[PDB]
Amino acid sequence: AATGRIVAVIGAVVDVQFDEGLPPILNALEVQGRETRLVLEVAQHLGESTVRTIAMDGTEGLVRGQKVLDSGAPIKIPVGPETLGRIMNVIGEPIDERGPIKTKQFAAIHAEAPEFMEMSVEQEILVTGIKVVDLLAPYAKGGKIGLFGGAGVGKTVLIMELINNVAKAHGGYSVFAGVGERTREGNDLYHEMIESGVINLKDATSKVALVYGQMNEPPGARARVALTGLTVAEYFRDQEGQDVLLFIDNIFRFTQAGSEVSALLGRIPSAVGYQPTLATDMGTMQERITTTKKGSITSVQAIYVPADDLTDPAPATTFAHLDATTVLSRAIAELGIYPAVDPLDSTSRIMDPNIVGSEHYDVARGVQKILQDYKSLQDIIAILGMDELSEEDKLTVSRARKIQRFLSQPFQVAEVFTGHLGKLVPLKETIKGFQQILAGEYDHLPEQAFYMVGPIEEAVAKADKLA
Amino acid sequence: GAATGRIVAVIGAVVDVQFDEGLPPILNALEVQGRETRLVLEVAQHLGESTVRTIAMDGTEGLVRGQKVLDSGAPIKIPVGPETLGRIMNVIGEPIDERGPIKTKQFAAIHAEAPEFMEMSVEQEILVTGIKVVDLLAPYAKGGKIGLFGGAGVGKTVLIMELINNVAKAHGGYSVFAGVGERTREGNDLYHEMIESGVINLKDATSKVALVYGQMNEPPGARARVALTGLTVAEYFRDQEGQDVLLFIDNIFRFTQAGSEVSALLGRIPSAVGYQPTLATDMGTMQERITTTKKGSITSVQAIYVPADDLTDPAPATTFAHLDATTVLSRAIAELGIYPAVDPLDSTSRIMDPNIVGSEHYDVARGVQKILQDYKSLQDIIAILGMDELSEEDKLTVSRARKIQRFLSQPFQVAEVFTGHLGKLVPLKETIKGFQQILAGEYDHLPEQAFYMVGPIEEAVAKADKLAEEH
Amino acid sequence: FAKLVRPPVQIYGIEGRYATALYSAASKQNKLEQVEKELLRVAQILKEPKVAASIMNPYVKRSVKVKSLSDMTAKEKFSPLTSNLINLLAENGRLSSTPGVISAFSTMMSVHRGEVPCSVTTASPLDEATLTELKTVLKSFLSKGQILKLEVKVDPSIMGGMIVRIGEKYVDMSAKTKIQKLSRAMR
Amino acid sequence: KTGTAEVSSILEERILGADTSVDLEETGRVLSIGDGIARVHGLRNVQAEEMVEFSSGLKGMSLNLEPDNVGVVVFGNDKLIKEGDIVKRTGAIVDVPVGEELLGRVVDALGNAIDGKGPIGSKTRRRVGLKAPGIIPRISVREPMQTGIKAVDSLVPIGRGQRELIIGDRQTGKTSIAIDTIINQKRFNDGTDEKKKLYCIYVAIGQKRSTVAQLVKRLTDADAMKYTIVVSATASDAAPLQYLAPYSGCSMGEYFRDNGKHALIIYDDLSKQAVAYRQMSLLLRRPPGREAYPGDVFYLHSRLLERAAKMNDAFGGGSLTALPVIETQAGDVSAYIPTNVISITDGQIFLETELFYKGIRPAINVGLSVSRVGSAAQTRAMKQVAGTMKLELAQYREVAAFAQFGSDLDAATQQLLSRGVRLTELLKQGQYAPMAIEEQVAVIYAGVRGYLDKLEPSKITKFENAFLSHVISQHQALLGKIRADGKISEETDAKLKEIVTNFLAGFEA
Ligand SMILES: Nc1ncnc2c1ncn2[C@@H]1O[C@H](COP(=O)(O)OP(=O)(O)OP(=O)(O)O)[C@@H](O)[C@H]1O
Ligand SMILES: Nc1ncnc2c1ncn2[C@@H]1O[C@H](COP(=O)(O)OP(=O)(O)O)[C@@H](O)[C@H]1O
Ligand SMILES: [Mg+2]
Ligand SMILES: [Mg+2]
């Protein structure tokens, strides 16, 4: 759509003067006369047939006068069923060098939100299969999750176990979207995913579609990575009707990169230093993840809290959209419990009897109670002694020890390491097992036999075999 | 004369001139005509259509637009040589003491470049001044660089005028005192404290100091260039003559801080907390000309004001790298009467090294600092448990540590008008021996008031006998 | 770059940039007294409901306002260095300020022989015997080989005098001198 | 709005005629110079990030391409540039000499020579602004890189192809963790093996010159300036020379990465590049942000610190390890630049000035330090003893409050106060004394196994020095059976039991 000469290059900001075919805002340009593709996405209009745009690769070797075309659309990306098991950057090019992605139709990355009369009005609960997550902090469908806990906690093994559970009972594929990630750790993620079974370099038996925008790529191309990993995630909602997942790592580097684009243009900053459009920019990304009538998109996002400040402007704005939290802490790994989930500091907004029912509420409020007093009398038994607690306190020692080991589970994606078969438990098998420990029907079981089993019938089975 | 420009815009202390014929380069000098005093403007920017942006060195009253401006062809040219000794001089090199003119045969333009990598003397030495905190804990070096930190009212004009007494009279080489923006009262004492003490002689030619004085009643473009008139007289004595020099500057924070007073009037966007965006560049342009090359040596002592006792301020915290030796005076110590106020756990030198000062000097000063950091972990217990709850080993720590803290204090000779005591000057061999014995236990039987304000350890037992006789 | 002839006004703003680049360019080759006759003929064709309909229109084209005036500026009378100047303003985007430059070039060219007139401000007008003196005793001040000009404006709030302004001089003799009798009430 | 190149001399020629006298496609005159930033009228064909070359002999670098002029930063003094000076082109992005003719030489940030030996003899070049490898040409790090410090090699280990941040306050021992990292490599760099060598680079950004001069003499006398390049943009320079100086040194250490060799680079320090960029942005009037840093300052330290990679067998098998140095201000690791560079790199080593005066030198905090790779980047013997050591020096930190006023405690709590203060005394280490790896596996084997509890804590730092000199001379055949085999077998685990106990008897005299 016409030819426009360049007229200014300042940093990661290019300035393109068209003649007739003036493109709309959010239109992707393509510079001609270069080695690999340099795209430019139009962000303003300035008058005098001049636009201004944010570059998405290095801005070196650009001469004042180069001819740049117009695609007549936004950034269009390969969207298909043959994009799983592959890796691409923000503008669709493959970077695992396994061959070009041979696809039929393309899709632009900028759309609008679902309509007011396309929503769903009855809240439902997306079971994953994990024991702690299903019960004490359940996921919604269409909901948004927060994942707290850095490296050294048992984190990436949780991500791959989610993807090997969503495709064994639900049938919806996923997307990974690393936003500004490390290039050194994008390869240990790729090479662990190969040997675990989710990406397969031989056939049509993949589950994840990696979209890596990495840390040495300019700030204009770091904000747009969660949209390109959202655009892929809608073909398995719109055009196929499945229950998509979507991982963003992490939700702070999406926010931090928006403040760099907004300060290269010239906009005056907000409170503590962020951009003025901080809640709308998070709005137009987070509103495209809903449960429409065809299918849904779920999301799982890791959050970094700067300077231990839970009222900082970036995690304040992100908490306004969340429907859950998950906290991975260093201490629960020391006990030997996997995954390292803190069941007292992990929440869920739909924890309410009108949404989850009556049976599920009066168990996840009972097993939430028995682990609160044990943290209190983890001091009285630590100073005064052992036999000096009451005989009704020799049962809050048992039933707060038998339970916090049954929050452990042998995963399936780490199959060769543990040597044990990966077990799955449905949502009525989580509830049937936790009720019988507060009822004390299995009060005659040692606290080690409640370790790395599946249903309630296995812990009992495991105990019989011992000794 | 060349390029007789014309004035167009006097906004503050930043005059802009417009040249018809010949544009002068950056860093020159310009001479405003028709004034009974000498006003010198230095070029700093080139704007387009033959207008430059200068900075005045005096008052900008009476500047009518359309006024002629001459040009000299070089930066500011001061006098220099041997005949500049026992004199006080202006920023543009003029007399301010009413003794007549400076008759020298050599001028030095104040803008030179830092000597290269292949002109760097590498050797370290030691230097003994006489003070039991300098010589024990942060020792100097012959040719090193020495900075005196600390807030306002903690003892920096006293500690720098005591080292002028100690070192700069028993020295064969010369000295220069450059006053970069301080009280004009304090610039009248040191002119008269050294006429009676023989360092300045007003009739013959055997003086051993030179003075450069531009004080804090001066416009903030002239309080940025007396730091450079200093080390241009203090470089002719190192390079041209092959001598040894001492460099005394008080205060060097007024060089940085008077660059923030004309930053935005020049046309720059201001950086963090209000400083100019060229902080660590105009500073390091100057603090690399104060070095010892292989033609001579310079031992530089500079007082460094820390604003509002905030050491993490960007004007002091970018000066901690241009220096070999730091003596940091605190205020919570000088409130206890301890004088010199020098912090024991914050001063630091490079030559504190078991291969230059010896492995007996080193084992002492790493046990003084280790028993003073052992004190502070007990002071948080005393505030709750009280003194008579501690064990008998920890009581022995507090008593020696308070004996050491009082023994680090020493009566200077310039406190003979403030306190009425008499002055000490302790040699190094006694300093090591005295502190070695308090750590051992050979003075565990004395009161603490013996150790306050003495010299050698043999004077701290001649006081514990007078206290017991007058009991 | 090169040095240029100093205009004797030296105005500033977006006018005096272009109105000195024209004075310096035309003072070369001694094209000075000629070019004012040509700038007063573009000073009439600018005010036209087809020419001014697109000399200040944003939405025509960036390019077609350059060929339409270059064909216009050459054919009818003149091809001096002004034909480049109209092509220079139009190439930059300063066509809106085109009447400003010629009003700026006129005040710059007037002082080459002019006076920057005075302003007698007294009352209802006067006879010939008291005015031809003030059109001659106001010539006795300047004395530099010049032919004076003048303005008149009537104001009655000045009760009993005349004010005059030879340049920036302002010799005031009027009924301000009632306010100067504050010193009687000022102790 | 007026526009920069709308001055009264630019318009004045266009009224005269066409501009045939100057061509402007290749040379452009200067409009306005000030504080190291120039404005040039012309130069229509200049690429972005291209060196120009002024009339007085200096150089430049093009950063702002604007619709009427170009703004170019100046290398060197500004009293040589003026208004009306012709600028020309070279035709390329800036390039630096690269080879093995740099080893033992001292170069500045443009590849020139400063040590006065002679001109560099290399026959190769390289552009400073190239890219990292991708996801594919790398592999996970597996190679030990040894420092010789008992704390750094046993508690926070480094591998080859890893970033590790040396962070800490002033006057703490930062420049000295990274100067016996260099001196330790002489063990391997004179022998015969080729996949254990290393070639070090030291970058000095903004330091004063006579601290570099005290470093070429520290390293010559310890005989480690036959494999060390020194790149030195010091403080008296111009601001862009200190901006290029870690890119200029990361291209010198990529030739050793593309050719199956190994290297190690030390940026000292990266908190003075980021201030040298900030001076250049805010005079080019780029819009500020928090603490007046520009928006693209995470983009400075992300494209630089991702060129350190561990390549694979189909590309050569090279490596590059980077240790960047960052100085905080009073323990504030939550300022702007110290929070970019903690997010980029793979761990930090945190040095405090409280521990420096309590008698623990090197003044490493173990609690506030981490390496993200860790136990894979260690030898199989240092992995064996530090897994019992890192745990037991962690149990001492929880009971470290009780030790001040305590004798009425439990015998278990009085044990953790005992064992934890012997292991702290082992980790002390004198300046400029790197150790061999299998010697550190001797010393640490004595403390963590139980052969130091019956001694006095001022006799620990004597016993270690007397245990080492006995085992170097009279047992040299067993400090090469760990340096070859790697893993402590049981046939060596039973032989060191008969050395330490048969030395602990005849010691206390
Ligand atoms: N392990 C050690 N044992 C004894 N002394 C040490 C040790 N490490 C460092 N020092 C001492 O620390 C002093 C300063 O250390 P150094 O300058 O290397 O640290 P730094 O934090 O880099 O300081 P700066 O940041 O100012 O350069 C030196 O004089 C040296 O003697
Ligand atoms: N021997 C001494 N030690 C510490 N302080 C002293 C001593 N003698 C006098 N003082 C007082 O301490 C103050 C220190 O101020 P001074 O050093 O003159 O200026 P600055 O504010 O630059 O530190 C002086 O006003 C003086 O009254
Ligand atoms: Mg003072
Ligand atoms: Mg250092």
Domain boundaries, chain A: 1-74, 75-350, 351-467
How many CB atoms neighbour CB B272 within 10 A? 16
Give yes or no: residues C103 and C144 share one domain: no
Give yes or no: residues D289 and D273 share one domain: yes
Point out the residue among A61, A215, A265 whose CB comes nearest to the CB of D48.
A61
* Nearest Cα residue to atom 15 of ligand 1: D173
DSSP for A155-182, please give it. Answer: -HHHHHHHHHHHHHHT-----EEEEEE-
Give yes or no: residues D419 and D364 share one domain: no
Give yes or no: residues D343 and D387 share one domain: no
The residue among A109, A252, A129, A257 whose CA lies nearest residue A175 is: A109
The residue among D438, D305, D371, D436 whose CA lies nearest residue D158 is: D371
Q: In this complex, do D11 and C21 lie within 8 Å of one another by their Cβ atoms?
A: yes
Known catalytic residue at D218: no
Resolution in Å, one decimal, please: 3.3
Give yes or no: residues D51 and D113 share one domain: no
Give yes or no: residues C65 and C137 share one domain: no
Give yes or no: residues C74 and C157 share one domain: no
DSSP bridge partners of B213: B179
Q: Rounded distance, CA D408 to CA A384, Å?
A: 16
Q: Rounded distance, CA C77 to CA B172, Å?
A: 89
B162 CB-contact burial (10 Å; exposed 0-12 / middle 13-18 / buried 19+): buried
Q: Collapsing DSSP states into helix, strand and coil, what is residue B190?
A: helix
Element (H, E) at B109: strand B106-109
Amino acid at A114: P
- Which domain-ending residue is among C112, C146, C177? C112
- Tell me how far the alpha carbon of residue B259 lies from the centroid of ligand 2, in angstroms: 28
Give yes or no: residues C85 and C140 share one domain: no
Chain D residues 49-108 within an 8 A CB cutoff of chain A: 49, 64-67, 93
CATH class of the region A351-467: mainly alpha
Kindly give the interhelix angle for D437-449 and D497-504, rounded to the nearest 10 degrees: 70
Give yes or no: residues C119 and C27 share one domain: no
> DSSP state, A133?
H
Q: Rounded distance, CA B217 to CA B219, Å?
A: 7
Query: Which residue is it, tokens 């070639």?
Result: D199
By the CB < 8 Å criterion, does C168 face chain B? no
Measure CA B165 to chain center. Answer: 15
Give yes or no: residues D361 and D445 share one domain: no
- Method underlying the structure: cryo-EM
Q: In this complex, do D298 and A15 lie within 8 Å of one another by their Cβ atoms?
A: no
> DSSP state, D335?
S
- 8 A C-beta contact, residue A31 and residue A64: no
- Which domain-ending residue is among D326, D356, D378? D378
Q: Is B66 left (phi over 0), alpha (psi -120 to 50) or beta?
A: left
Query: Which residue is it, tokens 């790697």?
Result: D486
Give yes or no: residues C1 and C24 share one domain: yes
> DSSP state, D457?
T
- 8 A C-beta contact, residue D138 and residue A187: yes
- Report the b/e string of A33-68 with b at 16+ CB within 10 A: eeeeebbbbbbeeeeebbbbbbbbbbbebbebebeb
Give yes or no: residues D163 and D287 share one domain: yes
**Which residues are near ligand 1 (CB < 6 Å)?**
B 350, 352-353; D 170-176, 361-362, 429-431
Q: Rounded distance, CA D241 to CA B38, Å?
A: 39
Q: Collapsing DSSP states into helix, strand and coil, what is residue B317?
A: helix
Point out the residue among D47, D140, D299 whose CB comes nearest to the CB of A219.
D299
Domain hosting C138: range is 115-186
What torsion do the CA atoms of B83, B89, B90, B93 make, to the nearest 10 degrees?
0
- Which domain-ending residue is among C62, C93, C112? C112
Cα–Cα distances (Å) from A424 to A46, A404, A419, in that order, read: 58, 18, 16
Give yes or no: residues C72 and C119 share one domain: no
Instruction: Please name the residues in contact with B1: beta carbons below 8 A apart, sequence gap of 6 or more.
Output: B70, B71
Q: In this complex, do D346 and A62 lie within 8 Å of one another by their Cβ atoms?
A: no
Nearest residue on chain A to D287, alpha-carbon basis: A266
Q: What is the CATH number of the domain that holds D393?
A: 1.20.150.20
Domain at A1-74, CATH from 3.30.450.40, 2.40.37.10, 1.10.10.10, 2.40.10.170: 2.40.10.170
Q: Rounded distance, CA C109 to CA C33, Å?
A: 9
Domain hosting D400: range is 379-509
At A30, give phi and psi (nearest 5°). Answer: -145, 120
Give yes or no: residues D460 and D506 share one domain: yes
Q: Collapsing DSSP states into helix, strand and coil, what is residue B239?
A: helix
Q: Rounded distance, CA D482 to CA D381, Å?
A: 8
Question: What tokens does B366 get?
Answer: 């790493």
Q: In this complex, do D344 and A215 lie within 8 Å of one another by their Cβ atoms?
A: yes
Give yes or no: residues C95 and C155 share one domain: no
Element (H, E) at C38: helix C32-39
Chains D and A touch (3+ CB pairs under 8 A): yes
> DSSP state, B345?
T
Chain D residues 120-139 within an 8 A CB cutoff of chain A: 129, 131-136, 138-139
Number of structural domains in chain D: 3
Give yes or no: residues D148 and D285 share one domain: yes
Tell whether A53 is in a known binding site. Answer: no
What CATH architecture applies to the domain B1-75? Answer: Beta Barrel (2.40)
Q: Collapsing DSSP states into helix, strand and coil, what is residue D477?
A: coil
Give yes or no: residues D122 and D171 share one domain: yes
What CATH architecture applies to the domain B352-471? Answer: Orthogonal Bundle (1.10)
Give yes or no: residues D128 and D70 share one domain: no
Q: Rounded distance, CA D9 to CA C4, Å?
A: 8
Q: Rounded distance, CA D176 to CA B342, Å?
A: 26
Question: What tokens does A130 get?
Answer: 């994990």
The residue among D124, D98, D103 whose CA lies nearest residue D250 is: D98
The domain made up of A75-350 has a fold known as Rossmann fold (3.40.50)
- Tell me how far the alpha carbon of residue D327 lies from the centroid of ligand 4, in angstroms: 9
Q: Rounded distance, CA D207 to CA B322, Å?
A: 8
Give yes or no: residues C36 and C8 share one domain: yes
- 8 A C-beta contact, residue C52 and residue C5: no
User: Span B76-351: which CATH code?
Assistant: 3.40.50.300
D49 CB-contact burial (10 Å; exposed 0-12 / middle 13-18 / buried 19+): buried
> D14-19 long-range CB contacts below 8 Å, 24 or more apart?
D14/C84, D14/C88, D15/C21, D15/C22, D15/C25, D15/C26, D15/C81, D15/C84, D15/C85, D15/C88, D16/C25, D16/C28, D16/C81, D16/C84, D17/C84
Give yes or no: residues D318 and D424 share one domain: no
Cα–Cα distances (Å) from A50 to A42, A54, A137, in that order, read: 10, 14, 52
Give yes or no: residues C108 and C140 share one domain: no
- 8 A C-beta contact, residue A37 and residue A30: yes
Number of structural domains in chain C: 2
Give yes or no: residues D160 and D291 share one domain: yes
Give yes or no: residues C24 and C54 share one domain: yes
Q: What is the CATH number of the domain that holds D192?
A: 3.40.50.300
Which position among A41, A161, A181, A234 bears the catalytic label?
A181
* Mutate which of B306, B418, B421, B452 for ligand 2 pocket (most atoms within 8 A of beta carbon): B418
Q: Rounded distance, CA A397 to CA A368, Å?
A: 15
- Which domain-ending residue is among C50, C78, C112? C112
> D312-318 long-range CB contacts below 8 Å, 24 or more apart?
D312/D137, D312/D138, D312/D139, D314/D137, D315/D133, D315/D137, D315/D258, D316/D257, D316/D258, D316/D259, D316/D260, D317/D195, D317/D260, D318/D256, D318/D257, D318/D258, D318/D259, D318/D260, D318/D261, D318/D262
